Design a protein around this ligand. Structure first.
Ligand SMILES: [Cl-]
Ligand SMILES: [Cl-]
Ligand SMILES: [Cl-]
Ligand SMILES: [Cl-]
Lengths: 268, 268
């Protein structure tokens, strides 16, 4: 053991999300927590759209309502294992509109974050079935007090969304995704730059497998504030356990103080 | 032959910039044009601060005044060699304030861009000598009509500065630098992500060698809209010649239409 206060042990579950089946998805997650959880794990990370996957045409019926089913499911697991869960995202109906809603729950079973994906793919029938988020991603604390941020899949292409959480003090950016195999290089390259430009840890938690339409990339990855690899996965399903040296954030921010030079009001 | 606007041949001059000596830097540049130019080259790119390098304490006496020396020097080369020159940047005085001023000149001797570096390096103590720019980087046209943008060194760490020129239609981002060897990984990782997130060509033109304080990386590179390597150099002083398939920009923008999803009023 290392004395507490400078590290965080993270498990990334690179799950093969079942197309349009919330009960098979919930069973798989329960089984992954049972097989993999230990007293030393601080945070578990789940991929994007873990309840129904990309079964967009059936979300009008299959999606959750006000995170009812998904929050209760995650709260039960968080409390049972006394662990924080950066609970990917879920297809969620709110006031007769379908959102791609990310959320996190702490070890005390409290909802700590809720965020609807701001950036819809104007190609992936996402404009046909989903509604774009109307709020920025806000920094929030994990159980150790560490400020973090949670963004979803396509959001990775938008450097603007991470700037506000980074300058507010966020130390870890959790990107939750179902990133295609066809754009694997983009996934690693963008996550690495998000880490460097904001001097912070970046965790990319991706899904894997084929859903009858799209082959997902797998290849979940952890990048430190310097842009160096902490740990990674391949295409196949598995868990990734990393121990993050949190001190590297303030160290990187002292060495390359980008936010002392930012010109917020100038950029067009 | 291919229709005008679909192709461009670019030469990148990875020069070892002489510390605080404008006359020797001009002699070296003239020698490189004489030795390297040919009738097929459309654009020549120089590194950042090519007149005095980083001799900050002597800029009050050594810097140019209102681009007088630098513009006349470059106008002569652009007109003699019938080529566009993305003239890196120079230490430049305006009303007793010293700027790091990038400029470009077309083959007809016209000044086509003037940009004062917006992001000064506090660790290099640039704020004690230089004045930060008051304007954004504006897209400008090269002789073939292609919209491009010119950014300086430390600007690379600020993703915001490239967003407006890219959404305005810029196809090439020219980053002109004196990037240190100690941050080589950051140079490659950031240039690659700027290309991907904006679906455009990125040309990183860097200096090389040792100025008596810092070892510069060299490693100039060209990245296509898909994030793939077009061409690159190593540490050594050399010229990089690349052929750009400009049609790749609009093709990439059609395939990954990020600016149809951008939420300009939302971001904090
Ligand atoms: Cl001027
Ligand atoms: Cl001509
Ligand atoms: Cl041209
Ligand atoms: Cl730097």
């Amino acid at each position: 053991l290392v004395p507490r206060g400078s590290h965080m042990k993270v498990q990334i579950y690179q799950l093969p999300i079942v197309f349009g089946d919330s009960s098979k998805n919930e069973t798989q997650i329960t089984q992954w927590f049972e097989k993999n959880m230990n007293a030393e794990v601080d945070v578990v990370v789940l991929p994007e759209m873990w309840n129904n996957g990309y079964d967009l045409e059936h979300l009008n019926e299959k999606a959750d309502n006000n995170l009812g089913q998904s929050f209760s499911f995650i709260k039960h697991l968080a409390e049972k294992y006394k662990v924080d869960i950066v609970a990917g995202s879920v297809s969620n109906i709110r006031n007769n509109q379908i959102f791609n809603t990310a959320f996190s729950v702490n070890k005390s079973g409290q909802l700590i974050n809720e965020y609807d994906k701001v950036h819809l793919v104007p190609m992936l029938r996402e404009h046909e079935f989903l509604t774009a988020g109307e709020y920025v991603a806000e920094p929030f604390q994990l159980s150790d007090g560490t400020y973090v941020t949670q963004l979803i899949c396509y959001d990775l292409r938008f450097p603007e969304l991470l700037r506000y959480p980074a300058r507010s003090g966020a130390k870890i950016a959790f990107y939750v995704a179902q990133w295609p195999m066809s754009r694997l290089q983009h996934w690693h390259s963008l996550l690495k730059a998000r880490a460097i430009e904001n001097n912070m840890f970046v965790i990319g938690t991706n899904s894997t497998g084929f859903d009858g339409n799209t082959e997902y990339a797998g290849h979940s990855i952890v990048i430190n504030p310097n842009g160096d690899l902490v740990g990674e996965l391949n295409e196949s399903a598995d868990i990734l356990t990393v121990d993050l040296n949190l001190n590297e954030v303030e160290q990187q921010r002292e060495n390359i103080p980008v936010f002392k030079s930012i010109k917020l009001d100038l950029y067009k």
